[PDB]
Predict the 3D structure of the following.
Amino acid sequence: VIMYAXXVXXXLXXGXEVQLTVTTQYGSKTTYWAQVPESLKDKNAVXL
Amino acid sequence: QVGIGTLIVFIAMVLVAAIAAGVLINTAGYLQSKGSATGEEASAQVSNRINIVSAYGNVXXXXVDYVNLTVRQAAGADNINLXKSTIQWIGPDXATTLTYXXXXXXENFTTXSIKGXXXXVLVDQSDRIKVIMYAXXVXXXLXXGXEVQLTVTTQYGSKTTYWAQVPESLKDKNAVXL
Amino acid sequence: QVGIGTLIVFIAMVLVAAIAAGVLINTAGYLQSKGSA
Amino acid sequence: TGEEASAQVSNRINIVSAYGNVXXXXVDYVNLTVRQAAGADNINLXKSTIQWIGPDXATTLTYXXXXXXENFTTXSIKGXXXXVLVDQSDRIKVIMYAXXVXXXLXXGXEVQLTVTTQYGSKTTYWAQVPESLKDKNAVXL
Amino acid sequence: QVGIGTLIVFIAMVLVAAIAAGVLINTAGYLQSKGSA
Amino acid sequence: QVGIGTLIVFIAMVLVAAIAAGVLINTAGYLQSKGSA
Amino acid sequence: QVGIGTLIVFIAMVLVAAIAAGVLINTAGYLQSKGSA
Ligand SMILES: *[C@@H]1O[C@H](CO)[C@@H](O[C@@H]2O[C@H](C(=O)O)[C@@H](O[C@@H]3O[C@@H](C(=O)O)[C@@H](O)[C@H](OS(=O)(=O)O)[C@H]3O)[C@H](O)[C@H]2O)[C@H](O)[C@H]1O
Ligand SMILES: *[C@@H]1O[C@H](CO)[C@@H](O[C@@H]2O[C@H](C(=O)O)[C@@H](O[C@@H]3O[C@@H](C(=O)O)[C@@H](O)[C@H](OS(=O)(=O)O)[C@H]3O)[C@H](O)[C@H]2O)[C@H](O)[C@H]1O
Ligand SMILES: *[C@@H]1O[C@H](CO)[C@@H](O[C@@H]2O[C@H](C(=O)O)[C@@H](O[C@@H]3O[C@@H](C(=O)O)[C@@H](O)[C@H](OS(=O)(=O)O)[C@H]3O)[C@H](O)[C@H]2O)[C@H](O)[C@H]1O
Ligand SMILES: *[C@@H]1O[C@H](CO)[C@@H](O[C@@H]2O[C@H](C(=O)O)[C@@H](O[C@@H]3O[C@@H](C(=O)O)[C@@H](O)[C@H](OS(=O)(=O)O)[C@H]3O)[C@H](O)[C@H]2O)[C@H](O)[C@H]1O
Ligand SMILES: *[C@@H]1O[C@H](CO)[C@@H](O[C@@H]2O[C@H](C(=O)O)[C@@H](O[C@@H]3O[C@@H](C(=O)O)[C@@H](O)[C@H](OS(=O)(=O)O)[C@H]3O)[C@H](O)[C@H]2O)[C@H](O)[C@H]1O
């Protein structure tokens, strides 16, 4: 699932946390607390 | 007619179970997110720690004016930011808690680089950053014998203590090792 | 009707235990890699 | 119920270090430096209470604004707010007048501080004054 | 009505876990202060 | 709800280990500085 | 007439859950005092 964060919000810096709820058509809800690593120094890709 | 009655009650049971089933899962949804985050932060607090390799100090006239520390990230430590860390100075005159700045003085410390690209972050195991502390701008210089207690604390809460004991004599020493 | 209600809740209890099982292993997975390092 | 109980267990307030002033020949202030625990949310120190089991008076301290009497005052060591811990890197110093709560503090005396947050998580710190305070401007209880 | 029974029993396990959780934290606090001293 | 109860108890264990780990490292910290002097 | 049956049985479940719920609450209380001491 693709999400352009610099267009949705304002491009997350370090530490910035986002709470996502993916709700299916029938109604089932899945929560994910995607928290950016507190440091992004010399990292090409991170694991939220 | 009894068939008509049980049908409507049956519709109630599937809806009542669905509500009970639903909130049973979303409650587990919150706790698993909190449980996952708690495990990561708890391990970070234990592991992401700063090791103090060495500490020296410039000597003017006969009183130590600067206190420098070469810091290195501990074993198995992720990125450590030296701007989100506070150094607590338990000296002979004051007891302030130093914070980060940008070129030292006052009740703030500055970090110059030694080996690395970033002069404020410990990216790899092989980087050393020098923590500049102005003793003449925090207390009242640092004469002989006057020891201070420094505890560098990272943002996660890891604490490293170092007793900077000035040499008992400061005569004919341009720079000494605290 | 009680049997029907039990079956729906049974699915939730199965799924809830799976979620609790999952985080337990995944947390241990991160810890072993951090511990090994 | 699930949300509240999880906050009760998880959101806790940790204590980094303690230090206090030394006037004449005794300790008059007992300052702290608190920090959020693993995954703790916003901790409002204005809604928390500190239980003081001292050598003399054993009371429960509430919050005020500059401290004396039976209250504590919270200054901000590092952060935007000075009464609530928001980020993991926030440090707030609580100030407690030991010459107002009790009759100052001498050597050997120990204080049992229980910092209970609003939700209920309790952190206990056994502040022990050093057994000698000769020629010390500040100590580390 | 089987779903109803789960709800209150669910609430119970939240509390007993909270009660169980506490006894370790405050106990470990004592050995924390005692061990340091 | 057995899974839900496991989660909160799991949060207890990590914190307790975090407290216990904090004791040993800081306790060794003072000994390190005292021993060096 | 079928709706009368599920009402009374519903009353049984909440009490049965409450009876069971208390059992863990009070039992956890004993080990809390037992464990703390
Ligand atoms: C801890 O590390 C800091 C790193 O900056 C070091 O700082 C330097 O101390 C010098 C001195 O007080 O020891 C000071 O020296 C003056 O300025 C120099 C330069 O212009 O910066 C230079 O003119 C002269 O010193 S030197 O280059 O001959 O050594 C002197 O006039 C530096 O400015 C200062 O940054 C601390 O000394 C050390 O303890
Ligand atoms: C190590 O930790 C330090 C802690 O101070 C951190 O320093 C801060 O970095 C911020 C950013 O560069 O990441 C910078 O943020 C300011 O505020 C931003 C926003 O309004 O919040 C933005 O205006 C600017 O930053 S940025 O969006 O262009 O990146 C900036 O004005 C803080 O000023 C800076 O102290 C380090 O980044 C970290 O490595
Ligand atoms: C615990 O934390 C409290 C936080 O307030 C701290 O309180 C301050 O102690 C100062 C001193 O160390 O006793 C005291 O100093 C006087 O007042 C200063 C100012 O007007 O506030 C200043 O005039 C003088 O001190 S200084 O600026 O030269 O250092 C002095 O007359 C502060 O008023 C007091 O709030 C405790 O010390 C600490 O233990
Ligand atoms: C930590 O907790 C403190 C608790 O005092 C909080 O500060 C207080 O917040 C109150 C409110 O929650 O904003 C505010 O209350 C005032 O008085 C109320 C009433 O008359 O008693 C009411 O007018 C307003 O509040 S409210 O009813 O809308 O909630 C408000 O004017 C207190 O003045 C304020 O000190 C801190 O913010 C928190 O961090
Ligand atoms: C080395 O150890 C000696 C031990 O005698 C110590 O001196 C004594 O300290 C006492 C105290 O700890 O300050 C002091 O006690 C006096 O009497 C107390 C009471 O009336 O019995 C009380 O008034 C005062 O002490 S206290 O309650 O505040 O602790 C005090 O006036 C003794 O008189 C004193 O000889 C040295 O200080 C230490 O360096």
Remarks:
- The first helix of chain F runs from residue 2 to 36.
- Chains F and A do not touch (no CB pair under 8 Å).
- The two ends of chain F are 55 Å apart (CA to CA).
- DSSP finds one helix and no strands in chain F.
